[PDB]
Amino acid sequence: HHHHSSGLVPRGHMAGHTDNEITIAAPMELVWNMTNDIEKWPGLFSEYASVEVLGRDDDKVTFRLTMHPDADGKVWSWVSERVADPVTRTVRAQRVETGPFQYMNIVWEYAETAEGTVMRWTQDFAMKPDAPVDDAWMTDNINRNSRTQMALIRDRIEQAAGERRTASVLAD
């Protein structure tokens, strides 16, 4: 691989845009497969109470997200769509029901490095003019919560990789 990476690193910055990367010490196939197994997100991520696949059109997958209750106790739920391309190791998603946003576009990209798989998440959005918070606020909130979720995904995938390795080394 000959490039190196490590840890959780912000990239780019500007309100309405977030860009963060994390290195996960696991091979690309495992990282790709677990992060894209969206019905198991509630066990991988800590932020979704449930993820339900609604349909697939060719590759476009359409799905409904339901969060845990927010600080006011409210439960937010919406439909998004995503196209995951394993050849370019890129996923492009957007909210279909935009909620308090005018739009929200989320791109995930993956590559290999000497330390494992780097996964970079970029989000672009703008709040509706009458939304309860502004872009600056939402930008800081998404950065902070992304950082927490990326780290938890890193931990759970490194755990899974370790367990599969132990099973294989102990098997005949």
Side-chain angles (χ1 to χ4, degrees), residues 1 3-59 61-172:
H1 298 114
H3 293 274
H4 292 265
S5 64
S6 186
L8 173 62
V9 187
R11 309 296 314 279
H13 198 48
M14 75 164 180
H17 176 81
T18 61
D19 189 344
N20 291 288
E21 77 179 18
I22 197 166
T23 291
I24 302 185
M28 164 77 82
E29 176 184 309
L30 189 66
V31 176
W32 176 267
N33 288 341
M34 291 181 73
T35 57
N36 288 293
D37 186 3
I38 66 178
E39 291 205 310
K40 293 198 165 43
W41 281 354
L44 180 74
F45 286 78
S46 73
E47 71 163 353
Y48 299 124
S50 57
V51 185
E52 26 182 293
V53 169
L54 296 182
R56 6 267 164 99
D57 163 34
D58 270 326
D59 164 310
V61 174
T62 297
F63 53 103
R64 171 171 286 111
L65 300 177
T66 303
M67 282 182 77
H68 303 294
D70 69 8
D72 305 323
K74 169 165 170 28
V75 172
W76 291 109
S77 173
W78 63 92
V79 174
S80 282
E81 56 184 34
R82 66 200 312 263
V83 174
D85 177 5
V87 179
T88 57
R89 294 296 178 189
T90 292
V91 180
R92 295 184 181 80
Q94 69 186 335
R95 289 185 59 150
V96 173
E97 302 177 298
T98 66
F101 294 102
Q102 289 182 62
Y103 70 99
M104 164 68 75
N105 285 334
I106 300 167
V107 176
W108 293 355
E109 288 168 283
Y110 302 71
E112 281 191 304
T113 64
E115 281 84 16
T117 302
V118 176
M119 174 177 68
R120 178 182 184 168
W121 275 10
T122 301
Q123 293 193 49
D124 291 284
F125 56 89
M127 304 309 299
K128 286 180 170 176
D130 66 349
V133 289
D134 66 18
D135 285 339
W137 183 100
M138 182 60 78
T139 300
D140 163 86
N141 181 258
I142 288 166
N143 277 320
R144 164 191 317 112
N145 296 333
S146 284
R147 281 156 206 169
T148 302
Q149 302 296 318
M150 294 174 91
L152 197 60
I153 285 164
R154 178 262 308 277
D155 295 352
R156 282 164 185 176
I157 292 170
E158 286 176 7
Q159 178 108 291
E163 286 167 10
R164 294 189 321 167
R165 215 133 56 222
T166 302
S168 171
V169 173
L170 301 188
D172 281 300

